[PDB]
């Protein structure tokens, strides 16, 4: 039997499924711990950066949770992903510790861009800026790659890199509630918002499991981001951005919030 994590209704995945956007054809690229196989998981390719992990899969658990929440299968077991049918790159940057460096995620955002990823998510950061960094997003993005990174959780009003960067998507963290998450880094810079507590998704040993986090949050977008780039297959980075900046829910609070709640029903219509 499959469930529905709350989040993937909060940002109502599920109508668009309906109108028969699930983000076929988007190629979506994971620059994290790896992704493993798993049954509720279809990975189409990817790289590793980190030297002395030479394979895709994941040691750590939070690269394959955050592939699920973008793209989890939509069939009869598991969980349901905002783009159930985004083809799934794992881009290994970060090791099984879940650190890497700024030269690895570089690596991992010059292949996106060589590879032809439409969404690229970065479910990481650091409170300082970095030039190696900047340069690669600003590669990817002039590759047409919508970077798509999560804000950070240091609870601080000031968001970290790379999200902090104009060519970055910065996503941050909501609750239940619809309220900002403790921890949800905001301010300057600041995008969107996504749900970030309690997010049910895949996790290695063929199973499932509940994370906090702006990283649960920035799936979420780029799987939305997913959805209205198969919608709208002529639309740039920066349109998908936008669009999804326009039609999300205002939740009262710019600095807190960005445009608001992701919502991909608003954006698919
Ligand atoms: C051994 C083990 C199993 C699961 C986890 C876990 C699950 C979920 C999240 C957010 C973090 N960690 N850790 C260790
Ligand atoms: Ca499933
Ligand atoms: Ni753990």
Redesign the pocket.
């Known amino acids: 039997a499959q469930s529905v994590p709350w989040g993937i209704s909060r940002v109502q995945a599920p109508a668009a499924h309906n109108r028969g956007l699930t983000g076929s054809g988007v190629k979506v690229a994971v620059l994290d711990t790896g992704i493993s196989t798993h049954p509720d998981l279809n990975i189409r390719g990817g790289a590793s950066f980190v030297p002395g992990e030479p394979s895709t899969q994941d040691g750590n658990?939070?690269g394959t949770?955050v592939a699920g929440t973008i793209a989890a299968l939509n069939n009869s077991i598991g969980v349901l992903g905002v783009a159930p049918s985004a083809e799934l790159y794992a881009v290994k940057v970060l090791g099984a510790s879940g650190s890497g460096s700024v030269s690895s995620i570089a690596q991992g955002l010059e292949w996106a861009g060589n590879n032809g990823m439409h969404v690229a998510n970065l479910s990481l950061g650091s409170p300082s800026p970095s030039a190696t960094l900047e340069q690669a997003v600003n590669s990817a993005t002039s590759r047409g790659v919508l970077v798509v990174a999560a804000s950070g959780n240091s609870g601080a009003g000031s968001i970290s890199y790379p999200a902090r960067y104009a060519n970055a998507m910065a996503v941050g963290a909501t609750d239940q509630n619809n309220n900002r998450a403790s921890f949800s880094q905001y301010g300057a810079g600041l995008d969107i918002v996504a749900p970030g507590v309690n997010v049910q998704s895949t996790?290695p040993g063929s199973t499932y499991?509940?994370?906090?986090?702006t990283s649960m949050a920035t799936p979420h977008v780029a799987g939305a981001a997913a959805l209205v780039k198969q919608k709208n297959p002529s639309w740039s980075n920066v349109q998908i951005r936008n669009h999804l900046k326009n039609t999300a829910t205002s939740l009262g609070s710019t600095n807190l919030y960005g445009s608001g709640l992701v919502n991909a029903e608003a954006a698919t219509r």
């Open positions: 658990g939070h949770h996790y499991a509940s994370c906090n986090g």
